[PDB]
Design an enzyme around this catalytic site. Sequence first.
Site, PDB file in Angstrom:
ATOM      1  N   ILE A 189      78.302  43.844  45.581  1.00  0.00           N
ATOM      2  CA  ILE A 189      79.569  43.933  44.863  1.00  0.00           C
ATOM      3  C   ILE A 189      79.605  42.890  43.744  1.00  0.00           C
ATOM      4  O   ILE A 189      79.210  41.739  43.941  1.00  0.00           O
ATOM      5  CB  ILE A 189      80.748  43.671  45.810  1.00  0.00           C
ATOM      6  CG1 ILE A 189      82.068  43.891  45.083  1.00  0.00           C
ATOM      7  CG2 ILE A 189      80.677  42.255  46.342  1.00  0.00           C
ATOM      8  CD1 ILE A 189      82.366  45.334  44.812  1.00  0.00           C
ATOM      9  N   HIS A 191      81.598  40.848  40.259  1.00  0.00           N
ATOM     10  CA  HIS A 191      82.843  40.190  39.851  1.00  0.00           C
ATOM     11  C   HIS A 191      83.495  40.839  38.626  1.00  0.00           C
ATOM     12  O   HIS A 191      82.817  41.430  37.779  1.00  0.00           O
ATOM     13  CB  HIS A 191      82.552  38.714  39.546  1.00  0.00           C
ATOM     14  CG  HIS A 191      83.675  37.992  38.861  1.00  0.00           C
ATOM     15  ND1 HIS A 191      84.642  37.287  39.546  1.00  0.00           N
ATOM     16  CD2 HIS A 191      83.997  37.885  37.548  1.00  0.00           C
ATOM     17  CE1 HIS A 191      85.510  36.778  38.688  1.00  0.00           C
ATOM     18  NE2 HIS A 191      85.142  37.128  37.468  1.00  0.00           N
ATOM     19  N   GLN A 224      87.097  39.595  42.913  1.00  0.00           N
ATOM     20  CA  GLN A 224      87.350  38.349  42.223  1.00  0.00           C
ATOM     21  C   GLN A 224      86.602  37.259  42.967  1.00  0.00           C
ATOM     22  O   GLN A 224      87.032  36.830  44.036  1.00  0.00           O
ATOM     23  CB  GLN A 224      88.853  38.056  42.226  1.00  0.00           C
ATOM     24  CG  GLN A 224      89.215  36.649  41.800  1.00  0.00           C
ATOM     25  CD  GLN A 224      88.619  36.304  40.469  1.00  0.00           C
ATOM     26  OE1 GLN A 224      88.753  37.062  39.518  1.00  0.00           O
ATOM     27  NE2 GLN A 224      87.959  35.164  40.386  1.00  0.00           N
ATOM     28  N   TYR A 225      85.484  36.812  42.415  1.00  0.00           N
ATOM     29  CA  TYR A 225      84.713  35.771  43.071  1.00  0.00           C
ATOM     30  C   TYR A 225      85.496  34.478  43.333  1.00  0.00           C
ATOM     31  O   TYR A 225      85.249  33.804  44.330  1.00  0.00           O
ATOM     32  CB  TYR A 225      83.445  35.456  42.262  1.00  0.00           C
ATOM     33  CG  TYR A 225      82.355  36.514  42.329  1.00  0.00           C
ATOM     34  CD1 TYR A 225      81.120  36.304  41.707  1.00  0.00           C
ATOM     35  CD2 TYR A 225      82.551  37.722  43.012  1.00  0.00           C
ATOM     36  CE1 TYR A 225      80.100  37.277  41.758  1.00  0.00           C
ATOM     37  CE2 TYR A 225      81.539  38.694  43.070  1.00  0.00           C
ATOM     38  CZ  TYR A 225      80.321  38.466  42.442  1.00  0.00           C
ATOM     39  OH  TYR A 225      79.332  39.427  42.490  1.00  0.00           O
ATOM     40  N   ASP A 226      86.432  34.127  42.450  1.00  0.00           N
ATOM     41  CA  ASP A 226      87.231  32.904  42.622  1.00  0.00           C
ATOM     42  C   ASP A 226      88.178  32.681  41.447  1.00  0.00           C
ATOM     43  O   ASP A 226      87.745  32.396  40.332  1.00  0.00           O
ATOM     44  CB  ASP A 226      86.317  31.680  42.761  1.00  0.00           C
ATOM     45  CG  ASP A 226      87.053  30.453  43.289  1.00  0.00           C
ATOM     46  OD1 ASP A 226      88.141  30.115  42.769  1.00  0.00           O
ATOM     47  OD2 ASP A 226      86.532  29.821  44.227  1.00  0.00           O
TER      48      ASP A 226
END
Length: 424
Positions: A189, A191, A224-226
């Site tokens: 997956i 971002h 959303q990675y972060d």
Amino acid sequence: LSPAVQTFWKWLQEEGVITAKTPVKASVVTEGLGLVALKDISRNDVILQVPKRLWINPDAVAASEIGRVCSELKPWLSVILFLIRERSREDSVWKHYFGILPQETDSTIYWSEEELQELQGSQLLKTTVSVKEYVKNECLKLEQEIILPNKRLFPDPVTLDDFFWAFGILRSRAFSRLNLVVVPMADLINHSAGVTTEDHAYEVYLFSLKSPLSVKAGEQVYIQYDLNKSNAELALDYGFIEPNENRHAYTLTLEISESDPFFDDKLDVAESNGFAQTAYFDIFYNRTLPPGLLPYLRLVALGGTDAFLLESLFRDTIWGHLELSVSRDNEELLCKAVREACKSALAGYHTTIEQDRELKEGNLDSRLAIAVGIREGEKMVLQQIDGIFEQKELELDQLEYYQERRLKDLGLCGENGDILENLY
Ligand SMILES: C[S@@+](CC[C@H](N)C(=O)[O-])C[C@H]1O[C@@H](n2cnc3c(N)ncnc32)[C@H](O)[C@@H]1O
């Protein structure tokens, strides 16, 4: 599609992980390999699940042959070894998985020396170096204290590349929202700035990944990675950055020097208020200064004249005073300090912001693109910071420092108290 991929998809089918039930397939995307929906997927719709029988965390390594020797090593140091080791063994469970992993990413940790020159003067470079160095040292020790001393457990040699490879695999693939877990299926997956929720990772064990957005058939599924990382942070952790200027940040490092004649008192004030001898303040573009930065700057710049504030008498309001400003010489000093740091730092880059912006207007290689973007952003923050303190210098007389705040309660114009006093 691809050999290893096709083989990897199969491997997941027989492992019971993926079936003809999963609404997504692997595909070649601009971001490498990604998960493209096979059918209209809805928000919060689970797209895939993996058996904890396939993790690769401090819980898989310890339950392995090298568990004993790594028992005392930090969780990540432990997983790196496990990763490298499992990579070699032409029978490991992560055989087909490893066959899919990229030999590299655009993380600054893999950049060549020329490539790194593009980050000249940038905080990102200072950080990447430190991280590379530190990981190096830490990884050599594991070779002489665990890898060599146990030539039975670690057959084939372990190159510095193997380390950075595994360390990279951790930084750009491990899920920390639950530790450090790796999931062969949900590792693909990608971002996207389009995802603004950040509520996807979750296990029922079983790692279940649910799409935070409605992806129509054919389109890619993202996450959303972060939402909190700076661009510098995405650059080093993963191999990319965003155009979103709200991601550009520059961290300032403050400290109460031990050579400070009031070191003991100052450190006492700082710790009594949640701040160590060394404190880091992250400054993001367009965001207001972090709380504590000014008061700490004022503490650092204190000085003999206002040292009376360090006396046991104010050890309950000193921080409040620090927040409300100490004195003009104190403010002027700290402003001078910050401004010189910005100018000095800004002068450390080899391109002007105009040059970077022009460059961005053409086609840039993924890594050059990262450098340009990162360095422009850093310059924007350095300049914004400096702009803020430039203004502050001008308003240097609009602040009501300690002495003034102290007299704001004299009551000079009260009653003719003498009349009352002469009444006894
Ligand atoms: C969790 S892996 C993702 C799987 C990867 N696409 C692959 O081919 O196996 C994260 C890495 O994929 C790439 N990636 C993910 N999201 C990206 C994005 N929005 N833009 C560019 N690269 C991205 C980066 O190299 C990143 O470090």
